Write a protein that binds this ligand. Structure first.
Ligand SMILES: [Mg+2]
Ligand SMILES: [Mg+2]
Ligand SMILES: [Mg+2]
Ligand SMILES: [Mg+2]
Ligand SMILES: [Mg+2]
Ligand SMILES: [Mg+2]
Ligand SMILES: [Mg+2]
Ligand SMILES: [Mg+2]
Ligand SMILES: [Mg+2]
Ligand SMILES: [Mg+2]
Ligand SMILES: [Mg+2]
Ligand SMILES: [Zn+2]
Lengths: 144, 174, 37, 216
RNA sequence: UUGGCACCUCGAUGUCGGCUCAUCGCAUCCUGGGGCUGUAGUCGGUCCCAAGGGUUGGGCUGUUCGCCCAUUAAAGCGGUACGCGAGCUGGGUUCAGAACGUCGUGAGACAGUUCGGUCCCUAUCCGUCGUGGGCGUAGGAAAUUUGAGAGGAGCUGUCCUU
RNA sequence: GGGAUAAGUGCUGAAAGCAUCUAAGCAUGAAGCCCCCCUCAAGAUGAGAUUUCCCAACUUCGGUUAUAAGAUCCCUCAAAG
């Protein structure tokens, strides 16, 4: 008999969390955050709905890289114009725009679907320690 | 690291204070502060400072040697300072002191001026000899290098700014 | 500078060193200077 | 740094001291007022909003831009100024010097000042690649069936597409253009006119924005 | 590049050169920064970094090439269906005529030559260049704006002085 | 002009009592990179900001209404097409 529970917007409740990016590797922080955004850590996780929780990331500037990624790691973007390839190093990206580095890493670890895009929108990253979502009453989360 | 193992003697006048890895060395001429490697452990005695490598791993051995040498340089520097003499060679080559800054004329249509830095002294003797004196060995060396870079010694005639004890290879003109 | 895959001492004075992940020869004679590449 | 808004009256010539002929553009910069001052504290950047040329006051059944609307009249009234046809910001000018409701005069600029003039270029309408992009015509004889065409628009199977930024026929003119390093030959306080050496972008009766040259 | 192979296309994938318009690589022609020199200076040789921009007009030939003339800072080398024929030309090549040499008994034939010789197509879709409408942007509006992004530009001679 | 760099050139410096531009550290270094200059740009759905304008009655209390500010139709036109 068909007995599997399916989550719906009526029965889904999304919490808010804060994660400190200080002394955390970009990839390993990103991989864990993506799961929280997807709602993989919930027992009521349903694939076709968003059961995941909102996540706030603070101190994005204090994210750490290993080896020579600071210089060697390059981000390429194309403008869709002939010869329109632009490059930023990971270190430079962290300095100029710490938030984008974190966001892009996590968004790359999310599914490329309409739901997936929505799950990425629930991510909020701030380079400083302070965050503007006090009204949301976020709960501090410690990476496992 | 034989160098690392060797203790750094402290002059009685000089006073050294260690704050974790960072070390502040106080001397009559000046006070120098640097941050040593965290792994390296430093034992301070009134007579002398001893630095011991935590492990026999290469990385620690290299840092031990560097740390020891750096600490020794600071203490010696505050005690006596480091002076490097640069001598201009060739006709029409002269040095003149404008305030703190040094002005050099070396076969350039434009006159050359080098800004003075803190904990550095620029002085010219006979208009051909310049002395850079400071507590920091590195800082003295860096500024001296800049002075030499203005006009480096040429092989053919030896004309240019050179270190007093520098040797220049000589090539026959014709 | 001589840039070549075979970097080796041309004379006794030449000294084999590794700088910035590249093997190089340093010597009093400027000619003997080499860089692996 | 100084900025004034004016209309392009037209071009003329003036004879210099040495008898050199100086081509000049006549600009009328009457009725300039500081309508608003923007600061980093409030707006996030420092600039002065300047309105040029008075328009008629609000009327009940205005069908044209000649008469000011209620929203515009309020903004001008806050400055204690009449409603203005053209309003533009000057970030170059220092906010502290100017005050809201202060008249900006031609006398601010002086003769011999190097300036950058901004205006919308004259509109040419729909134009072909030759006129619009300065492309070469094809042969006009020798069996030619190619005269004013754009030429090849790409390669072949490699790419199999036209690249973005391919120069093709389209609407020409109406672009904002800034001519740099022009000079003020003369300033007439009585006529409210500034004489600018050379030619400035746009049609006659077109708004021109005169600023101190950024490059110095 | 010359080939080898015969795997797509023979109910058609137009073939050389030029023109128009480019675009990309760098094994850099010029300009920029360097090392070494059998580098006196002025000039050079060689090697390393560098693709931002630039990189001419003619005579001969269908030519590509090449040679020549006169320049230039320089007259780069390649890829893009040897870029580009629903963008152009059609001189060469590759139909029917004719002729020469040559071969063939002949009809005829010749990467031998010579003279002449029909280049279609109203853009559906993507793409590209311009120009509007709808809705969104949690009230409805008029203006002035920030810039996440994106594009453009980016070259060099000579002379004087020192 | 500025910042960061390439090939380079160093300063201090050990592994390796010497030496060493590099390992830690610290400088300098190109028409090139990122800026500076010019133009576009909030469908930047992450849709931003500033200033100003308009602001009532009904009602089943769910909301509706024409109207406000405003903008158009239509008409005279060009600097626009
Ligand atoms: Mg050999
Ligand atoms: Mg032509
Ligand atoms: Mg015709
Ligand atoms: Mg085609
Ligand atoms: Mg077979
Ligand atoms: Mg078919
Ligand atoms: Mg190269
Ligand atoms: Mg072809
Ligand atoms: Mg033909
Ligand atoms: Mg025949
Ligand atoms: Mg044949
Ligand atoms: Zn040697």
């Amino acid at each position: 008999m068909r007995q599997t529970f399916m989550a719906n917007e009526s029965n889904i409740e999304r919490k808010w969390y804060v994660i400190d990016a200080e002394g955390q590797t970009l990839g390993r922080l990103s991989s864990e955050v993506a799961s929280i955004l997807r709602g993989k850590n919930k027992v009521t996780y349903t694939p076709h709905v968003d059961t995941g929780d909102y996540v706030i990331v603070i101190n994005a500037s204090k994210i750490e890289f290993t080896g020579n990624k600071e210089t060697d790691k390059v981000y390429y973007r194309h403008s869709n114009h002939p010869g329109g390839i632009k490059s930023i190093t990971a270190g430079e990206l962290r300095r100029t725009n710490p938030e984008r580095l974190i966001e892009n890493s996590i968004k790359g670890m999310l599914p490329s679907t309409r739901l997936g895009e929505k799950q990425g929108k629930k991510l909020f990253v701030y380079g400083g320690a302070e965050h503007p979502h006090a009204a949301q009453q976020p709960e501090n989360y410690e990476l496992r | 690291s034989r160098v690392g193992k060797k203790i750094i003697d402290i002059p009685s006048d000089v006073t050294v204070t260690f704050d974790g890895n960072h070390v502040t060395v106080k001397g009559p001429k000046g006070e120098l502060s640097r941050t040593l490697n965290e792994r390296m452990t430093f034992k301070q005695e009134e007579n002398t400072i001893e630095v011991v490598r935590p492990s026999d791993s290469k990385e620690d051995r290299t840092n031990h040697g560097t740390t020891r040498a750096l600490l020794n340089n600071m203490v010696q520097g505050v005690s006596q300072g480091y002076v490097k003499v640069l001598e201009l060679v060739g006709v029409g080559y002269r040095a003149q002191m404008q305030g703190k800054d040094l002005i050099l004329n070396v076969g350039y249509s434009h006159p050359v001026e080098i800004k003075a830095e803190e904990n550095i002294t620029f002085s010219v003797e006979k208009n051909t000899v310049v002395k850079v004196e400071g507590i920091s060995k590195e800082q003295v060396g860096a500024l001296a290098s800049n002075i030499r870079s203005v006009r480096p010694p040429e092989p053919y005639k030896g004309k240019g700014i050179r270190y007093q004890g520098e040797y220049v290879r000589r090539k026959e003109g014709k | 500078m001589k840039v070549r895959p075979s970097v080796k001492p041309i004379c006794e004075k030449c000294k084999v060193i590794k700088r910035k992940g590249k093997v190089m020869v340093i010597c009093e004679n400027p000619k003997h200077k080499q860089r692996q590449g | 740094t100084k900025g004034i808004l004016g209309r392009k009256i037209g071009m003329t010539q003036v004879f210099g001291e040495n008898g050199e002929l100086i081509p000049v553009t006549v600009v009328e910069a009457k009725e300039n007022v500081v309508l608003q001052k923007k600061t980093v504290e409030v707006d996030g950047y420092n600039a002065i909003q300047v309105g040029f040329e008075d328009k008629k006051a609000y009327k009940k059944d205005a069908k044209s831009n000649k008469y000011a609307n209620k929203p515009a009249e309020g903004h001008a009234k806050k400055a204690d100024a009449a409603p203005k046809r053209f309003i533009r910001e000057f970030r170059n000018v220092d906010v502290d010097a100017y005050e809201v409701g202060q008249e900006v005069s031609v006398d601010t600029f002086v003769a011999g000042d190097v300036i950058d003039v901004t205006g919308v270029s004259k509109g040419k309408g729909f134009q072909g690649a030759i006129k619009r992009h300065g492309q070469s015509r094809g042969p006009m004889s020798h069996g030619s069936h190619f005269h004013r065409a754009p030429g090849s628009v790409g390669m072949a199977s490699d790419a199999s597409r036209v690249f973005k930024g391919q120069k093709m026929p389209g609407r020409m003119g109406g672009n904002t253009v800034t001519v740099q390093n022009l000079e003020v030959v003369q300033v007439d306080t009585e006529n409210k006119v500034i004489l600018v050496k050379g030619n400035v972008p746009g049609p006659k009766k077109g708004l021109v924005e005169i600023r101190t040259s950024i490059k110095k």
